[PDB]
Design an enzyme around this catalytic site. Structure first.
Site, short mmCIF file in Angstrom:
data_model
loop_
_atom_site.label_atom_id
_atom_site.label_comp_id
_atom_site.label_asym_id
_atom_site.label_seq_id
_atom_site.Cartn_x
_atom_site.Cartn_y
_atom_site.Cartn_z
N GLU A 1 25.82 26.18 38.50
CA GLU A 1 27.01 25.35 38.34
C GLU A 1 28.08 25.76 39.34
O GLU A 1 28.38 26.95 39.48
CB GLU A 1 27.56 25.44 36.92
CG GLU A 1 28.97 24.88 36.79
CD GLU A 1 29.77 25.54 35.69
OE1 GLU A 1 29.16 26.26 34.86
OE2 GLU A 1 31.00 25.35 35.65
N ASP B 1 36.70 41.43 38.34
CA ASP B 1 37.90 40.94 39.01
C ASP B 1 39.04 41.90 38.73
O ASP B 1 39.38 42.15 37.57
CB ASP B 1 38.24 39.53 38.53
CG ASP B 1 38.46 39.45 37.03
OD1 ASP B 1 39.33 38.67 36.60
OD2 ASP B 1 37.77 40.18 36.29
N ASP C 1 43.10 42.91 39.90
CA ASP C 1 44.27 42.23 40.43
C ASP C 1 45.49 43.13 40.31
O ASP C 1 45.54 44.05 39.49
CB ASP C 1 44.52 40.91 39.68
CG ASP C 1 45.38 39.95 40.47
OD1 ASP C 1 44.98 39.57 41.59
OD2 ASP C 1 46.46 39.56 39.97
#
Ligand SMILES: [Zn+2]
Lengths: 103, 389, 217, 125
Positions: B44, B109, B111
Site C-alpha cells: 500500500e 521514527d 524527531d
C-alpha cells in the site's frame, strides 16, 4: 439448543420463573452478527471495532420503534381507543423481534 | 542555500518525479526480487495531494503502473504502508474483515519535537548544527543496538527532512514480526520514562544492563562536544536549576556553591562528577549517568513502531515546508552527516533544467542513490545466501 | 519420574475397553483433586508437598516400571486419561479454568523432579529445536549475564544451566530489561525457562480446550 | 392529468397467463354512495431486471482457461447482445452500468462490483 437436566420432584416453597427477553435477537445485537460481518465458508465472531450490519440495524430500529410507542403509550389525555392500538403495536413489534432469528 | 518557495511546489514536483525519482531502485527495494507472490501488488502507498485530500489505499501491479499513476498525479506527500492479504486497491471487493496487514518493515521514527525540555538552542520547530548532534546521539545508540543486541543486519537510516530521521529495518524475519514484539522492542530500547511533566524521568538500579553501559560509553564520547560545550546546559542559574532538580536536595546547596565560582561548564561538570562520586561512595543511584541518559538518550514513539499498518514517510520524498529530500544516511560516515548539505527539490530541479535515463547521476542525488544501491545489493546478497544455499 | 513430561497434543488413536475408560477417568479426576487439596493445604516448596504428590502419583499408577517401547503403562495411562478428561472439562468456562490451573501444577511438579541433566534433552526433543550453551561460552559472557540478570543476588553464576533462546520467545522478559541479548539471543536461567514453559503450556491447553468445546455435540 | 386515491388491501399476479401485470384490490371513497366501495387497478409493463457480473479476464468456456484479454463492460454488453439475446429470443432491452453490493451465500462474488443492469419486457423468454 441447550436443555438443562430438570430436577424431577415436588417442591414445597415458592418457585420463581424467569425467562429471557428475546435471547437470540439480543445475541445478534450484542455480537454484531450479520451477513456483512461474519466470515463464512463454527465461524469466529467479529471484533467489536466493526460497525453495525444491516440486520442488527434493523433490530435496533425495531426496538427504537418500540421505545417510541412505549413513550407515546405513557402519554396521558390520549384517545381511549389509541391505547389499544399502542398495545397491539407493542405486541406486533414483540413478535417481529422474536421471529427475526427464524429467517 | 536558497529560500524554498512553497507556491512553486506544484510545478517542480512534476519535474522531480518525472526525471529524477529513482523508480528502478524504489521498485527493486519494494519488490525484494519477487521471491513471494505479490509483495508489491499487495503493498500500500499513500499520497497526500492538493487540497489536503487524503487517499490511503493505493496499489500498483508493477513499476510501469507506479510510474503512470505517480507521474500524472504528482503527490505532495508519499507514504509507505504494509503488505495486505488482498490488494489495497480492491479492499471493498472482499468481505468486511478479510482485509488485514501482515508484513511491514520495522520503522523507528525519531524527531526533535521530543527534545523540548532538554534543548536550549532552538525552538520546538527549528534545528541548528549545534543540536543536530542529538540526532547522531541516537544513530550510534539505536543502529548499534539493533545490529548488536537484536542482530538486525539490514538497516537504512533516512533523513526525514526537518526535525529528525527514520530507520527502516527490512530483514525477512523482521517484516513478519508481530505488534506485541514491536512494542517490547521499543520498550526495551526506551529508557526515559516521560510522565506528566515529571522532573525525574530516568531511574537506574545497582545492576546496570550492558546496553545502558555501552550507550553511556557512546554518549560519553560525544557528551563534551555537544551537551557541555556546544549547548552549555550548565552556564546559568536558570540553566542549572533543571540540572539540580534531578540531584537530591541535600546536594543542591553544595552544587550551587560549586557552580557559583566557576566560569565555564567544563569545570562545573568535573566537580559535579567528583561530588556525585563522593555521594555514591558514601551512599548507588548512578547520578552522573542519569543526567546523561535524560539529556542525550533518544525518545521513541510507541504508537508508530507498534503499529503493523502505520504509514510513515517514504525515502527520497519531499518535505512541503522546506523541500529537502528524504535521502538515505551513510552509516559509514555518521558524524559527517550535514542537514544543510542535503539538496532541495528546487535545487535539484534547477540543476536538471541547466543541463537509459540516468539523469540522477548528473545531480547531487547520486551520493545518496549509491548508498541506496549498496543497501539493495546487501539485500540481494542476503537473499542469495539464504535461498541458493 | 520417567519420561512422562509431555506436552499433551496428538490425541491417541488406540482403542480400549469401557472399564479401562472409566477407571482412567476416575483415576485422573482423583489425582487432580489431590493436587488441588495439596496446593490449598500446603505450599509448593515443602518436602510434604512433593512427598504427598509423588505418593499420590505412585498409588494411582502414573509412574512405574517400563516395557517394550510401545506399551509403557504409566505413559499410556497419563496420555489417555488427560485426553479423556479434556472432554469432561471442556464444557464450561469455570471448569476450563479449573482444569487448566490444576494441570499446570502437575507439570510444574514433574519438571521440578527431573535432574538438571534430563531437562536439556526434554527441551531439545520437545517441540522442534531448543539449545543451551557450553562452559566456554558460559564463562566468556558470565559478567554480562550476571549484570543483565534480575535482582538475583551476587555474581555467583553457578552450575545451573543457562539457555540461549530467540529473543522474541523471551518477550515477557526482554521488554523490561531483565535478560542479556547478543545477536538476537537471550540467555536465561532455569527459573525463567520454566516460567516460559508454563506460559506456552497454558496457551496451548486453553486453545485446545476451546477448540474441543465446539465439537462436543 | 388525472389521479385518484385508493386504499389497497390485496394483490394478484398471473405469470403463466398474463406476465408483467398486477391487480391491486382495495377500497375507494365514492361521494355518490357516501361509502367506500371495492375497486381494482391493473398495472402493466413490469420489466424484468437482470444483473450480469463481469469477469476479471476473458476465458474460453470450451477449454476453461484465460485468453489474455481483460474484460470490460463493453465486452459484457457485446456478449449479451450477440450470443445471449439472440439465442434466447430477446428483441428489446435497456442496458446500464450500476454499482451494487452483495453479502450472501453464493461463492466467488465481490461484495461491491459494477454489474450490468438489463431490463426487458416480461413476455420475452
Ligand atoms: Zn539548535
Amino acid at each position: 439448543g441447550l436443555v438443562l437436566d430438570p430436577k424431577v420432584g415436588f417442591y414445597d416453597k415458592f418457585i420463581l420463573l424467569l425467562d429471557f427477553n428475546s435471547l437470540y435477537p439480543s445475541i445478534i445485537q450484542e455480537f454484531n452478527i450479520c451477513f456483512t460481518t461474519v466470515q463464512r465458508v463454527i465461524p469466529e465472531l467479529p471484533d467489536p471495532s466493526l460497525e453495525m450490519g444491516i440486520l442488527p440495524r434493523e433490530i435496533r430500529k425495531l426496538v427504537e420503534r418500540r421505545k417510541q410507542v412505549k413513550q407515546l403509550m405513557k402519554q396521558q389525555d390520549l384517545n381511549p381507543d389509541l391505547i389499544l392500538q399502542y398495545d397491539i403495536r407493542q405486541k406486533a413489534l414483540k413478535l417481529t423481534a422474536n421471529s427475526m432469528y427464524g429467517c | 542555500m536558497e529560500t524554498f518557495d512553497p507556491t512553486e511546489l506544484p510545478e517542480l514536483l512534476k519535474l522531480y518525479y518525472r526525471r529524477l525519482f529513482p523508480y528502478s531502485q524504489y521498485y527493486r527495494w519494494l519488490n525484494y526480487g519477487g521471491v513471494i507472490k505479490n509483495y508489491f501488488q499487495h503493498r500500500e502507498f499513500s499520497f497526500t495531494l492538493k487540497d489536503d485530500i487524503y487517499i490511503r489505499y493505493q496499489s500498483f501491479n508493477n513499476q510501469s503502473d507506479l510510474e503512470k499513476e505517480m507521474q500524472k498525479m504528482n503527490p505532495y506527500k508519499i507514504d509507505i504502508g504494509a503488505v495486505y492479504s488482498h490488494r489495497p486497491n480492491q479492499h471493498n471487493t472482499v468481505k468486511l474483515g478479510a482485509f488485514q496487514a501482515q508484513e511491514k518493515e520495522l520503522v523507528f521514527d525519531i524527531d526533535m519535537t521530543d527534545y523540548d525540555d532538554v534543548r536550549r538552542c532552538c525552538s520546538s520547530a527549528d534545528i541548528c548544527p549545534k543540536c543536530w548532534t542529538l540526532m547522531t546521539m541516537a544513530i550510534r545508540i539505536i543502529d548499534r543496538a539493533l545490529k548488536e543486541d537484536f542482530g538486525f543486519k539490514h538497516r537504512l537510516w533516512v533523513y526525514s527532512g526537518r526535525r529528525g530521521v527514520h530507520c527502516w529495518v527490512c530483514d525477512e524475519s523482521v517484516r513478519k514480526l508481530s505488534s506485541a514484539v514491536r512494542s517490547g522492542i521499543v520498550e526495551y530500547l526506551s529508557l526515559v520514562k516521560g510522565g506528566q511533566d515529571v522532573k525525574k524521568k530516568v531511574h537506574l538500579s545497582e545492576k546496570i544492563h550492558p546496553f545502558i553501559r555501552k550507550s553511556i560509553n557512546i554518549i560519553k564520547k560525544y557528551f563534551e562536544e555537544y551537551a557541555l560545550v556546544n549547548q552549555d546546559i550548565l552556564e546559568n542559574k536558570e540553566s542549572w536549576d533543571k540540572i539540580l532538580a534531578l540531584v537530591p536536595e541535600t546536594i543542591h546547596d553544595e552544587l550551587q556553591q560549586s557552580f557559583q565560582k566557576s566560569h565555564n561548564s567544563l569545570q562545573r561538570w568535573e566537580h559535579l562528577k567528583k561530588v556525585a562520586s563522593r555521594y555514591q561512595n558514601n551512599i548507588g543511584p548512578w547520578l552522573e549517568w542519569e543526567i546523561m541518559l535524560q539529556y542525550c538518550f533518544p525518545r521513541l514513539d510507541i504508537n508508530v513502531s507498534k503499529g503493523i499498518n502505520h504509514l510513515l514517510k517514504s525515502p527520497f520524498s519531499v518535505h512541503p515546508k522546506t523541500g529537502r529530500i528524504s535521502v538515505p544516511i551513510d552509516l559509514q560516515k555518521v558524524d559527517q552527516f550535514d542537514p544543510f548539505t542535503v539538496p532541495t527539490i528546487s535545487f535539484i530541479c534547477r540543476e536538471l533544467d541547466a543541463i537509459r535515463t540516468r539523469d540522477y547521476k548528473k545531480t547531487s542525488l547520486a551520493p545518496y542513490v549509491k548508498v541506496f544501491e549498496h543497501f539493495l545489493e546487501n539485500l540481494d546478497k542476503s537473499r542469495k545466501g539464504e535461498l541458493l544455499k | 519420574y520417567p519420561h512422562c513430561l509431555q506436552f499433551y497434543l496428538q490425541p491417541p488413536s488406540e482403542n480400549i475397553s469401557l472399564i479401562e475408560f472409566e477407571n482412567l477417568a476416575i483415576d485422573r479426576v482423583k489425582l487432580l483433586k489431590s493436587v488441588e487439596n495439596l496446593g490449598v493445604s500446603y505450599v509448593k516448596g515443602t518436602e510434604q508437598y512433593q512427598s504427598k504428590l509423588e505418593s499420590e502419583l505412585r498409588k494411582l499408577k502414573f509412574s512405574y516400571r517400563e516395557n517394550l517401547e510401545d506399551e509403557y503403562e504409566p505413559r499410556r495411562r497419563d496420555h489417555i486419561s488427560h485426553f479423556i478428561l479434556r472432554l469432561a472439562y471442556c464444557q464450561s468456562e469455570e471448569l476450563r479454568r479449573w482444569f487448566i490451573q490444576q494441570e499446570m501444577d502437575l507439570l510444574r511438579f514433574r519438571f521440578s523432579i527431573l535432574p538438571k541433566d534430563k531437562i536439556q534433552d526434554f527441551l531439545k526433543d520437545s517441540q522442534l529445536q531448543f539449545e543451551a550453551i557450553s562452559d566456554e561460552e558460559k564463562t566468556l559472557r558470565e559478567q554480562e549475564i550476571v549484570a543483565s540478570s534480575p535482582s538475583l543476588s551476587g555474581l555467583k553464576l553457578g552450575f545451573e544451566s543457562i539457555y540461549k533462546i530467540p529473543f522474541a520467545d523471551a518477550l515477557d522478559l526482554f521488554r523490561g530489561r531483565k535478560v542479556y541479548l547478543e545477536d538476537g539471543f537471550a540467555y536465561v536461567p532455569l527459573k525463567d525457562i520454566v516460567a516460559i514453559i508454563l506460559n506456552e503450556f497454558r496457551a496451548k491447553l486453553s486453545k485446545a480446550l476451546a477448540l474441543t468445546a465446539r465439537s462436543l455435540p | 392529468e388525472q389521479v385518484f386515491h385508493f386504499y389497497w388491501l390485496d394483490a394478484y399476479e398471473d405469470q403463466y397467463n398474463q406476465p408483467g401485470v398486477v391487480f391491486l384490490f382495495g377500497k375507494v371513497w365514492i361521494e355518490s354512495a357516501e361509502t367506500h366501495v371495492s375497486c381494482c387497478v391493473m398495472v402493466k409493463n413490469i420489466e424484468r431486471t437482470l444483473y450480469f457480473l463481469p469477469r476479471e479476464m476473458k476465458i474460453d468456456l470450451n477449454t476453461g482457461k484465460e485468453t489474455g484479454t481483460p474484460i470490460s463492460m463493453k465486452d459484457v454488453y457485446e456478449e449479451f447482445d450477440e450470443k445471449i439475446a439472440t439465442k434466447y429470443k430477446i428483441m428489446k432491452f435497456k442496458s446500464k452500468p450500476v454499482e451494487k453490493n452483495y453479502a450472501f451465500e453464493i461463492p466467488d462474488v465481490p461484495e461491491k462490483s459494477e454489474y450490468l443492469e438489463v431490463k426487458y419486457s416480461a413476455e420475452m423468454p
